[PDB]
Amino acid sequence: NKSDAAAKQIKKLEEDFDGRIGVFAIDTGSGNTFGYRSDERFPLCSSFKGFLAAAVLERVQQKKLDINQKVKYESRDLEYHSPITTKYKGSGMTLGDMASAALQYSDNGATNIIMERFLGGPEGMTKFMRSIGDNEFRLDRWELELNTAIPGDKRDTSTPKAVANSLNKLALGNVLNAKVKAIYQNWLKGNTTGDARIRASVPADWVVGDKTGSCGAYGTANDYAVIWPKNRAPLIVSIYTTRKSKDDKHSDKTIAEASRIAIQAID
Numbered sequence: 196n197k198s199d200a201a202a203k204q205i206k207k208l209e210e211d212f213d214g215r216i217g218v219f220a221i222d223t224g225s226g227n228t229f230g231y232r233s234d235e236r237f238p239l240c241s242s243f244k245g246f247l248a249a250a251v252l253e254r255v256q257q258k259k260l261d262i263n264q265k266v267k268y269e270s271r272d273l274e275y276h277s278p279i280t281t282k283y284k285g286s287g288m289t290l291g292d293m294a295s296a297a298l299q300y301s302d303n304g305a306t307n308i309i310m311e312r313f314l315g316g317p318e319g320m321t322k323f324m325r326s327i328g329d330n331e332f333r334l335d336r337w338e339l340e341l342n343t344a345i346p347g348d349k350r351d352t353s354t355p356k357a358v359a360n361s362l363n364k365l366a367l368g369n370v371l372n373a374k375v376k377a378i379y380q381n382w383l384k385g386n387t388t389g390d391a392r393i394r395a396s397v398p399a400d401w402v403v404g405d406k407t408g409s410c411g412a413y414g415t416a417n418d419y420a421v422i423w424p425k426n427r428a429p430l431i432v433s434i435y436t437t438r439k440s441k442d443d444k445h446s447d448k449t450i451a452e453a454s455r456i457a458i459q460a461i462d
C-alpha cells in the first residue's frame with residue numbers, strides 16, 4: 196500500500212527528470228525496507244570516500260596506522276578539489292584529519308593520498324568492501340577519473356542496496372570496535388556537502404550522517420545517510436541517480452524528494 200505508492204512516486208520522479216533513481220532504505224528498528232532499482236549499478240562518485248574513511252579506521256584499529264601519525268606531501272601537486280589538503284601543504288595532516296577531510300569535504304588529494312599509501316590503491320579499497328561481504332562494490336580508478344559516469348560502464352559503480360547494507364555494517368554494526376565506530380559516526384555526522392540532499396528530507400532535530408557524490412557527467416549524483424530520529428532506531432538511506440544526456444545537471448531536489456518518499460515508505 197505505502198510501498199506501492201512510494202514506487203509510483205519514484206518512477207514518476209525519474210520520468211520527471213528523465214533519468215534513473217535507485218533507492219534502498221532500511222529501518223534498523225522495525226525491519227521495514229523499500230527498494231527501487233535497488234540492485235542496479237550506479238556510479239559511486241565521491242560517495243565511496245565515506246567507505247575509504249572506514250577503511251582507514253580499520254587499519255588504525257588493527258594498529259597498522261596511528262590516527263595521529265603525521266602525513267606529509269610537500270612534494271605533491273594537489274588534485275583539483277583538495278580544499279583541505281592544499282592549506283596544510285607545508286605542515287602535513289594527521290592521518291585522522293586527512294581521512295575526515297576526504298569524507299567531510301570530499302577532498303581529492305586526501306582520497307588519492309590515502310589510497311596510494313594506506314589502502315593499496317583502488318583494488319585495495321575494493322578488497323576492503325569484499326572483506327565485509329559486499330560483492331557489488333567496485334573501485335577501479337583514482338580521483339578524478341573514477342567520475343566519468345559513462346553509461347554501461349562497470350567501473351567505479353555499486354548498487355543502492357549494497358551501499359545501504361555496507362553502511363549499516365560500517366556505521367552501526369560490528370566491523371569497527373567501539374571508539375573507532377564513534378569516530379566514523381562523528382565524521383559522517385560532520386559531512387558538510389549534504390545539506391540539500393537527504394538532510395533536507397528530514398526534520399532539523401533528526402541526527403544525520405551522510406556522504407554525497409556528484410560525478411559531474413550524466414547528472415550523476417547520490418547520497419547515503421544514517422539517520423537517528425529522536426527516540427528511534429537509526430534508518431539507513433541510500434539514493435543513487437543518473438540522467439539520460441551527458442550534459443544534464445545533477446538534481447539535489449530529486450534526491451531529497453526520493454529520500455522523503457523512501458523514509459515515508461519504510462516508516
Ligand SMILES: *C(=O)N1C[C@H](NOS(=O)(=O)O)CC[C@H]1C(=O)NC1CCNCC1
Pocket residue numbers: 240241242275276300301339342388407408409410411
Ligand atoms: C565527487 O563526486 N566529487 C568531488 C567533489 N565533492 O563531491 S560532492 O558530491 O561531495 O559534492 C565535487 C565533485 C566530484 C568530482 O570530483 N567531480 C569531477 C569535477 C572535475 N571533473 C569532472 C568530475
Ligand SMILES: [Cl-]
Pocket residue numbers: none
Ligand atoms: Cl600527474
